[PDB]
Write a protein that binds this DNA or RNA. Structure first.
Ligand SMILES: [Mg+2]
Ligand SMILES: [Mg+2]
Ligand SMILES: [Mg+2]
Ligand SMILES: [Mg+2]
Ligand SMILES: [Mg+2]
Ligand SMILES: [Mg+2]
Ligand SMILES: [Mg+2]
Ligand SMILES: [Mg+2]
Ligand SMILES: [Mg+2]
Ligand SMILES: [Mg+2]
Ligand SMILES: [Mg+2]
Ligand SMILES: [Mg+2]
Ligand SMILES: [Mg+2]
Ligand SMILES: [Mg+2]
Ligand SMILES: [Mg+2]
Ligand SMILES: [Mg+2]
Ligand SMILES: [Mg+2]
Ligand SMILES: [Mg+2]
Ligand SMILES: [Zn+2]
Lengths: 155, 116, 127, 83, 207, 99, 60
RNA sequence: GGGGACUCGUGAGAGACUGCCGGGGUCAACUCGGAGGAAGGUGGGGAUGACGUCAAGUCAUCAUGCCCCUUAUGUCCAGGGCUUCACACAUGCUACAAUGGCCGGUACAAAGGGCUGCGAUGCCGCGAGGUUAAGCGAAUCCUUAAAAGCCGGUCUCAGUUCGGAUCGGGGUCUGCAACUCGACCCCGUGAAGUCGGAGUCGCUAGUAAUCGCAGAUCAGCAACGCUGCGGUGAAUACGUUCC
């Protein structure tokens, strides 16, 4: 932090679907170190993402991510007696991270029975611009467009 | 169905349905459903009428179920109160009878907080 | 004299025996999908074999002792990667940049007095 | 006596006090300090005076105290209320 | 109170043990009488200046080695005190104790003696600066000492505020492990209470 | 063969082997045969004591006890060295378990 | 400790599970080890001096 | 039987030092990258706490100045209390479920203790255990069967097949003795709780999170505590404006 920028860990491709996004997706479903249960859910939510679309599930996921990747998020700061949020431009590698927890994070609190389809019913709707994960990327934008006046506080 | 005045629910297996009698848990139920042939997958919405009749005399010849099983419990409390044991001077006051810590915890025999 | 090497990851220590052939991993006798039943472990076992370009050949079988199922799997990676140096001392820099020769010195940090894990502190509670 | 192997343990110095009086139909009072003792039905007919720390609290073993110890009849902690 | 015992920080690395045996079942009963011996060689020989007491044992043959600055004081009137406590060592352990009394090559270059002679001078009310500054200069003469630190604490001079001041010459590195640091604690009896003396000598580097 | 099986327990390295490879190994010139030192695993107790004499529980210090039971020495029963190894002198730091 | 109780804790008591263990050196009834016969204090002073063998400072 | 090949045990040694190459830097310190390397700039943790502060803590480890009791403030006993509760705080543990509960399969540990002991194996007991007695001062033998995980079934979102508190009943073990006041087992019961207000805490990598195993005290235990060990194994670090 305060000295320099910290080094970054690499990633290994998933054997079932060769893609960096897939192991990065299994890694954030993971609670409690139970890793193979987290790959028994992401595989079961991509394989069920072709039973009712028929297309390739990686291509479904590269576009449901592209409907939840933000590019302009907002970031609080205090000046005097009023504290007011300043919009900042988002670097690309942070964008894929906020997008991907917006998939898993809303999928826990849907209304189905098991996590195998709750992640599937959110990858489905975000590929068409429907779900609650897509609701936030515009509220992240609309909160940060309704404050464009404070755009000269880049710290 | 209706085993002994106890109103077995519907759409629930017999492994769990006999547990609703006051006096049958998960172990005595497994030996009611072995001495009378009834398997551990039989739903309650398709019980045969005489198959319940086998089910209601192995219980009423060996076990003790309610009506008098509630009378077993509260009369055994009723004896300890009148003999004057300390454990019956403990049911008089809503305090734990088994030497539990009464300083910080023990809300269950007492009730929730009141902050006087 | 056939070639045998040793790999070790966490506290799992393995002993790989290198036989030329058709690629049949008979680990402790039984096969690769018998007690490595996870596909992600099965990638990192044969991961050095796609750099030496002999993923088909070299039917090996090995000894598995200590550690757990990912340390045992990760130790088998180094044991293959050490074995393809003695049987061909001319693909050294193919596997050097792949990071499979490095033993990856990562063990469990010891538990400390006062603390309740290696680095976890208990509650602070300034009054 | 908590285990059924070694039988119901009751202290000896009170067993001799009840056997000397039960044979000739004599029901006195008995001063004792053995709270650990269990009720045998051998001394249904007469009373006791068990210790608590202040003073020997009297108890009359009537018919259904049996099985229980003597010391369940001396509360040893007073507590007549916070207010 | 922050500094650990310098014979413990170096034990096995530089310095060596001061009791030698092996036991598994009787390890406890040996210690229970190994300190019952060390209560007998503190009161009764304190006029002789014991430097240290070494106690080893080889299959019911117990060997006490004991160093002091005045060897003839432990011996007595030609074998009346060296064998007085040999009759007392043996009626406490029930064996054949061979008390081999030995000597000290320099009692002005060894703690627990320099740490004790300062304490006798405090016990007879010399000025504690003068008691400390002798030992500092009576130790820096010898060819093996390269530094000394003496530290006194307690009701010094018959005062009321307990205080703690030290003197120091040369170099005394208490952190270096390749350096031998002899160390001695002794507790002066005075008419107001106690005064503790701590003396740290540095002899150099070992390898 | 070599029916004598003796055990060596000490409390330190470099006092059990230097006291055997030049002391308890001296059987090879006295009409018998050896195998040499055979090192065994060091057992290691752990004691943890609170430093302060009152109230400071989060301040401890750790002590061990390294029992270096080592050096399986297996020698040939020559009848002039059956009892002569009892005549061999060993220091206090090492025990021997010939039986 | 209290010297009536140091002497009483070495003799033969009634009901021989009633017997407990004190330290040898000092007399603490609590925190007494059985492989040394000492307490947690007296073990710590004697281990740094060298006065009981095999024990040194450990660092794994 | 046998083998000196591979591990592993443990002895002595080699190794990493900005030492070599290219930039920047007073021909300095040093810094940003590459080669070679198991490891790269302190390789990752432990030990080690300067002069001193806080009249910090302990006269209850012990030692001790002075004062104090000395037919009692000494000392031996048996019972009793340290465990009591109208309530407040604090550190934890189990939870409120489907990334789960309950059943049947089936794998991979480490570091440890054991002669006042450890109890294989066989027989009996639903179970704690009971009983016989093989082997072993132990790299032998016992402790040992690791739990999560993996493959199948089942419950289908309910205060429940979640939860296991309280209370009846019947037993086992250590111990003179388990009533105040022990742990474990079995049977019935089936409490509160549906992710917690203002506030606040821990963690930068084999780390948090979760999963068991063992030790020290110990006759047995309030062992969920403490000291240790491994199994599985994450996310993020723009930056120094703010606390
Ligand atoms: Mg703590
Ligand atoms: Mg861990
Ligand atoms: Mg605190
Ligand atoms: Mg006891
Ligand atoms: Mg240093
Ligand atoms: Mg104060
Ligand atoms: Mg105070
Ligand atoms: Mg006093
Ligand atoms: Mg008493
Ligand atoms: Mg208490
Ligand atoms: Mg729910
Ligand atoms: Mg349950
Ligand atoms: Mg199971
Ligand atoms: Mg059986
Ligand atoms: Mg399953
Ligand atoms: Mg409710
Ligand atoms: Mg840090
Ligand atoms: Mg215990
Ligand atoms: Zn002590």
């Amino acid at each position: 932090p305060r000295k320099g920028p910290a080094p970054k860990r690499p990633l290994v491709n998933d054997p079932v679907y060769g893609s960096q996004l897939v192991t990065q997706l299994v890694n954030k479903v993971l609670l409690k170190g139970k890793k193979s249960l987290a790959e028994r859910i992401v595989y079961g939510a991509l394989e069920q993402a072709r039973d009712k679309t028929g297309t390739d599930p990686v291509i479904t996921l590269k576009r449901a991510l592209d409907n939840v990747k933000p590019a302009l998020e907002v970031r609080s700061r205090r000046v005097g007696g009023a504290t007011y949020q300043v919009p900042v431009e988002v670097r690309p590698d942070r964008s894929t991270t906020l997008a991907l927890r917006w998939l898993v994070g809303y999928s826990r609190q849907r209304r189905e029975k098991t996590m195998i389809e709750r992640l599937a019913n959110e990858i489905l709707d975000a590929s068409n611009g429907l779900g609650a994960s897509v609701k936030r990327r515009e509220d992240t934008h609309k909160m940060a467009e309704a404050n464009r006046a404070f755009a000269h506080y880049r710290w | 169905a209706r085993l002994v005045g106890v109103d077995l629910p519907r759409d629930k297996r017999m492994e769990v349905a006999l547990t609703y009698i006051f006096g049958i848990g998960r172990t005595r139920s497994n030996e009611i459903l072995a001495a009378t042939g009834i398997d551990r997958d039989l739903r309650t919405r398709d019980l045969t009428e005489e198959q319940l009749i086998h089910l209601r005399d192995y219980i009423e010849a060996n076990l003790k179920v309610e009506g008098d099983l509630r009378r077993e419990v509260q009369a055994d409390i009723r004896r300890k109160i009148e003999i004057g044991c300390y454990q019956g001077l403990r049911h008089r006051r809503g305090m734990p009878v088994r030497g539990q810590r009464t300083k910080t915890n023990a809300r269950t025999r007492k009730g929730p907080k009141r902050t006087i | 004299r056939p070639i045998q090497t040793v790999g070790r990851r966490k506290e799992a220590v393995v002993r790989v025996r290198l036989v030329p052939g058709t690629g049949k991993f008979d680990l402790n006798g039984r096969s690769l999908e018998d007690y490595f039943p996870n596909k992600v472990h099965q990638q990192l076992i044969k991961a050095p074999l796609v750099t030496v370009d002999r993923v088909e050949s070299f039917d090996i079988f090995a000894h598995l002792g200590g550690g757990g199922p990912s340390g045992q799997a990760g130790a088998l990676r180094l044991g293959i990667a050490r074995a393809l140096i003695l049987v061909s001392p001319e693909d050294r820099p193919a596997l050097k940049k792949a990071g499979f020769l490095t033993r990856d010195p990562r063990a469990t940090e010891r538990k400390k007095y006062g603390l309740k894990k290696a680095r976890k502190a208990p509650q602070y509670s300034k009054r | 006596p908590r285990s059924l192997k070694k039988g119901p343990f009751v202290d000896e110095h009170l067993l001799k006090k009840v056997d000397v009086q039960n044979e000739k139909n004599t029901k006195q009072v008995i001063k004792t300090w053995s709270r650990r003792s269990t009720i045998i039905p051998d001394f249904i007919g007469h009373t006791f005076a068990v210790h608590d720390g202040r003073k020997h609290v009297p108890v009359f073993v009537t018919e259904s105290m049996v099985g229980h110890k003597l010391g369940e009849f001396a509360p040893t902690r007073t507590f007549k209320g916070h207010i | 109170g922050q500094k650990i015992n310098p014979h413990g920080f170096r034990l096995g690395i530089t310095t060596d043990w001061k009791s030698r045996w092996y036991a598994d079942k009787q390890y406890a009963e040996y210690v229970k009488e190994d300190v019952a011996i060390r209560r007998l060689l503190s009161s009764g020989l304190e006029r002789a200046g014991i430097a240290d007491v070494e106690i080893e044992r080889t299959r019911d043959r117990v060997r006490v080695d004991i160093h002091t600055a005045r060897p003839g004081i432990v011996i007595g009137r030609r074998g009346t005190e060296a064998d007085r406590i040999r009759a007392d060592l043996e009626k406490l352990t029930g064996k054949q104790v061979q008390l081999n009394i030995l000597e000290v090559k320099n009692p002005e270059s060894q703690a627990q003696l320099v740490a004790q002679g300062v304490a006798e001078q405090l016990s007879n009310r010399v000025a504690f600066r003068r008691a400390m500054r002798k030992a500092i200069q009576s130790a820096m003469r010898q060819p093996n000492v390269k530094g000394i630190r003496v530290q006194c604490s307690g009701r010094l001079g018959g005062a009321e505020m307990s205080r703690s001041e030290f003197y120091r010459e040369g170099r005394v590195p208490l952190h270096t492990l390749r350096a031998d640091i002899d160390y001695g604690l002794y507790e002066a009896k005075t008419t107001f209470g106690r005064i503790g003396v701590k003396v740290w000598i540095y002899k150099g580097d070992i390898v | 063969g070599q029916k004598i099986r003796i055990r060596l327990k000490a409390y330190d390295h470099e006092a059990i082997d230097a006291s055997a490879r030049k002391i308890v190994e001296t059987v090879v010139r006295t009409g018998a045969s050896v195998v040499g030192p055979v090192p065994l695993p060091t057992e290691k107790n752990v004691y943890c004591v609170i430093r302060s004499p009152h109230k400071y529980k989060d301040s401890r210090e750790h002590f061990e006890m390294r029992t270096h039971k080592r050096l399986i020495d297996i020698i040939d029963p020559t009848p002039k060295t059956v009892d002569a190894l009892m005549r061999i002198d060993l220091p206090a730091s090492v025990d021997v378990n010939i039986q | 400790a209290k010297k009536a109780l140091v002497n009483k804790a070495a003799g033969k008591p009634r009901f021989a599970v009633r017997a407990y263990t004190r330290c040898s050196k000092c007399g603490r009834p609590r925190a007494v080890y059985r492989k040394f016969g000492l307490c947690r204090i007296c073990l710590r002073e004697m281990a740094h001096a060298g006065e009981l063998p095999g024990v040194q400072k450990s660092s794994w």
